[PDB]
Amino acid sequence: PLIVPYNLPLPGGVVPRMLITILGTVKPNANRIALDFQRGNDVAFHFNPRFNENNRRVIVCNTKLDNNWGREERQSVFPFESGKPFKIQVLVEPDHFKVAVNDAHLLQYNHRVKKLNEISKLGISGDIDLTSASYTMI
Numbered sequence: 001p002l003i004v005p006y007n008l009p010l011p012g013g014v015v016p017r018m019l020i021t022i023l024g025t026v027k028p029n030a031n032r033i034a035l036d037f038q039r040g041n042d043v044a045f046h047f048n049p050r051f052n053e054n055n056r057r058v059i060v061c062n063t064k065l066d067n068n069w070g071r072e073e074r075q076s077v078f079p080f081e082s083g084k085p086f087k088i089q090v091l092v093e094p095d096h097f098k099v100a101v102n103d104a105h106l107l108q109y110n111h112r113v114k115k116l117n118e119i120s121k122l123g124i125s126g127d128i129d130l131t132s133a134s135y136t137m138i
């Protein structure tokens with residue numbers, strides 16, 4: 001597979017029509033998963049499934065600028081399960097990242113970072129076995 005945390009370079013950053021695909025399997029008794037689309041030290045798009053925040057599962061999304069987290073966007077629809085294989089597709093659209101899991105639409109996250117072509121790395125971390133991570137222009 002791939003060693004986690006995993007760094008996927010995004011050459012020339014991202015752009016609308018760019019589709020990023022992350023394939024792996026949630027570990028048993030998972031606590032968290034994170035995708036971090038970074039512009040240098042900033043995090044343009046943080047996508048963070050939490051398996052046990054006050055005994056609830058929640059996906060937390062956010063942006064980090066100059067080392068400071070902004071306002072969280074939270075989604076209680078939670079398609080992940082401990083022990084099960086997943087696919088995350090992040091499609092960059094003009095105004096938002098569009099995220100589907102296992103071919104079902106999950107959430108959109110509006111662009112806060114405007115310089116899309118400088119979002120040049122994806123960090124993939126957490127309680128997963130990572131099989132593959134890649135991108136394609138659609």
Ligand SMILES: NC(=O)[C@@H]1O[C@H](CO)[C@H](O)[C@H](O)[C@@H]1S[C@@H]1O[C@H](CO)[C@H](O)[C@H](O)[C@H]1O
Pocket residue numbers: 046048060061062069070072
């Ligand atoms: N930024 C925080 O420390 C926040 O703490 C409160 C509790 O006071 C909540 O736990 C909140 O979710 C964050 S935890 C923090 O969240 C960012 C995303 O906003 C990211 O997931 C980071 O890894 C977490 O430490």
Ligand SMILES: [Mg+2]
Pocket residue numbers: 112113114115
């Ligand atoms: Mg910007």
